[model samples]
Target: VQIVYKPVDLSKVTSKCGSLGNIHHKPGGGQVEVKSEKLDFKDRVQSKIGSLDNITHVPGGGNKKIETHKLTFR
Candidate 1:
């Protein structure tokens, strides 16, 4: 299946979330360039940020335990 890729806003992202080291640009003209239109250059950037959503421990993991203990109070 072909996954759709969205337009990238590099300003809203950080290196901590995804890498910027390998990004390509035109130093002379100050313009963005993607070498391969058929390839997943932008997709890679989007996926890098999306990777953060794969969390083993969700936001309420500890909250569930706390609620369970509260009900057991004697």
Candidate 2:
């Protein structure tokens, strides 16, 4: 009963969906393509964060628990 979990992916999905939906409704070829190109950018950041979070659990997340703690107190 010691393991606790975080909903990082769930929040990311919901937030991205809402912003992407708004972009989908806007007019312009550039805006449409912006949606596609942005995924790579977001994915890069997502992957970095995931690495830190994985260490928080056996499943794979990150070392953020310790890093963030140090940053927070300073």
Candidate 3:
């Protein structure tokens, strides 16, 4: 799959959430997850973030909870 990722405004998210950090963009700001058949995903988007979970097995999987000291690309 050809993907081009960009950190669009997350404010559009309707869910009520809390806890976070500042803009301090570290090399690995965080990771995002996508469901696909390819377990080894090649990130062509070259986004600032990366994918942690590739639920190529789980059917209709959702974003899994994560514990991190910095903001992730969830």
Candidate 4:
């Protein structure tokens, strides 16, 4: 995830995934790939926090278009 911080406010932010959940991290800052045979609803819920735009901001004063990959499960 891309975190845009302004003046670095730790009290206002929270780490739901990543090291907080004991998920391994890759070098150079990348998300750790998770592989599970069985699906866990709670884990999925914790991973999703609204959407990508829910945390990012537009470069300049312009509208933001949020899109997700179209895929089918099962």
Q: All candidates: CA RMSD in angstroms?
A: 21.3, 17.4, 19.7, 20.1
| Tens digits of per-residue lDDT for model 1, 1-74 | 45454554435322233342554443332434344445445533543322223223322223321212222223
TM-score, cand. 4 vs. native? 0.17
lDDT of 2 by residue, 1-74 (tens): 25454544323212112222222233333321222234445443643322212122232322333223222222
After superposition, candidate 1 runs with Cα above 4 Å error: 1-16, 27-74
**Which segments of candidate 2 are over 4 A away from where they belong?**
1-24, 31-67, 71-74
Worst 10 residues of 1 by lDDT: 64-73
Candidate 2 local accuracy as lDDT?
0.30
The lDDT leader among the candidates is: 3
What's model 2's lDDT at 56? 20
Per-residue error (Å), model 1, residue 35: 36
* TM-score per candidate: 0.13, 0.12, 0.14, 0.17
Tell how far residue 12 is off in model 3, in angstroms.
11
> What lDDT does each candidate get?
0.35, 0.30, 0.44, 0.42
Model 3: per-residue Cα lDDT over 1-74, one tens digit each: 45455553444323444554343533534556755464554858445334453232322333554444544462
Task: Please report how far candidate 4 places residue 20 from its true position, in Å.
Answer: 35
